[PDB]
Design a protein around this ligand. Structure first.
Ligand code: MG
Ligand code: MG
Ligand code: NI
Ligand code: NI
Ligand code: NI
Ligand code: NI
Lengths: 138, 142, 142, 134
DNA sequence: GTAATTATTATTTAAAATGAATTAGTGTTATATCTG
DNA sequence: CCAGATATAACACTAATTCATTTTAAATAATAATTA
């Protein structure tokens, strides 16, 4: 059904669940699920490609990422995704923060889907700790 | 000790469907990775909400769009960055068209001092767009 | 075709000895890699020296050092790049100190246009340094 | 002292590309050109090694590589993190399916700059590496 | 009592690791050129 | 043809890299136990 109440499982570090649980009460939340739902809704609103500007003409965007370069086959995956994406990727500026942290600004060209897709495909990778898209126009 | 544990989430079917369709089926590796990334997302905005001048491991990216034709605009922007008490790491510039320039200014330092640049640079005549991406490093288990 | 072949080279023992000393002293993966790299090196030289405004596949990096204090120097440089017939891919800027700025300008186009951009930018008052790195793409079997 | 021989493994196209340079530049054999190239490499590598002023210099390393070369990208980032304080930033351009351009901005004295430079150009898959000192 | 939320265990799936098969790199021996 | 020589080809062996394999862990499904 549409309204039916379902469950889904998530595998993660104890540290991360603790950090999540630590946030339930203080922000005026009754349940862990109640919070997770709002976070999902939050992501669903920020990762919306249409309604920003119609006809989805090629726009310019900047994707800010943070990842651990130690993560096995992560860089190979990221560069492979970007090469597969051709002209949609203008360039990447990288900062080696510390031994387990890399800052990277990926400058993208494309329509609302194309950009959204890249934010999700790169951000979706295991080891990519942070990914925030800044949308402009081109 | 840090080990991998599980946990279930109760929600409407239509909400899980929207999550799977709009995000996991549109590139995301797993539902668990998204949840982890959403946790990391909130974990970051906490560090930035914590206005402690001791921490400088709060890295940020300022995305700016401007017309280079605007007199003294590039002169003033570079002046602000050189003057800055914050460590401006580097700036990547894209010449979009004759009247459009994109810059990504990578900054380090104090929350207020970094927002001061966003305020200063964004405030300039000819700076059409200015958005700050508040970011930070993460531990090996984060 | 995609096939790995071998070939012998006759020379004095002392010349091979001093070659293998620089392979260890500079830590190159293999002797074959160095031979391939110096063939590639010579091939880029040849590509550029054969001045033909037809080849627009040529990639180059222009390294500049200047004083940002020099009035409208930054506006003129960006004007030069926007005006440029070449494809200015991007520019990375480093604020070295109060009177020093480092920029790496990635260019793609024909030898002449890439060089006019060097002539112009390097010619500017306040430009303390300008060195062009003439590079090129290489095919799978190169 | 005495004349000895050595083998080199490479792609047929690259040897073909090399063989075209012989007559065209005034050489008798392939070995003649290879020797001359070795002699040419050994001279510019010596003057670059000498004159080490222990001053705070900035340098740019321009590299070209094939990202298809298994984890070459990972290796490069490992080298750069290993001497992190020196490496200011890296700008990457995805040229085509088999070409990547990177500009690595380095900081330090002659000795600590040469250490980092050679560690990257030496890598298998790194087709081009040219430093710019300042 | 009902129903949503957590916890635990099971099944599916993706990541590591292992090791044979293969390939790349270099040293050695042999044939093809070369010069006068 | 010739010495008397280097240049190139062929062959051989060794270090390195694939790839298909097994092994291990992570991601979801299912279900049981709790809490509203
Ligand atoms: Mg991720
Ligand atoms: Mg190489
Ligand atoms: Ni890094
Ligand atoms: Ni511009
Ligand atoms: Ni500067
Ligand atoms: Ni690339």
């Amino acid at each position: 059904k549409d309204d039916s109440i379902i469950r889904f499982s998530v595998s993660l570090q104890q540290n991360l669940l603790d950090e999540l649980d630590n946030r339930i009460i203080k922000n005026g939340y009754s349940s862990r699920s109640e919070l997770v739902r709002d976070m999902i809704r939050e992501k669903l609103v920020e990762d919306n490609w249409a309604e920003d500007n119609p006809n989805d003409e090629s726009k310019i965007a900047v994707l800010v990422v943070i990842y651990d370069h130690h993560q096995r086959e992560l860089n190979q995956r990221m560069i492979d995704i970007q090469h597969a994406s051709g002209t949609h990727v203008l360039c990447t500026t990288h900062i080696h923060m510390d031994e387990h942290n890399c800052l990277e600004t990926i400058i993208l060209q494309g329509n609302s889907f194309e950009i959204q897709r890249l934010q999700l495909e790169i951000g979706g990778l295991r080891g990519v700790k942070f990914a925030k898209l800044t949308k402009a126009s081109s």
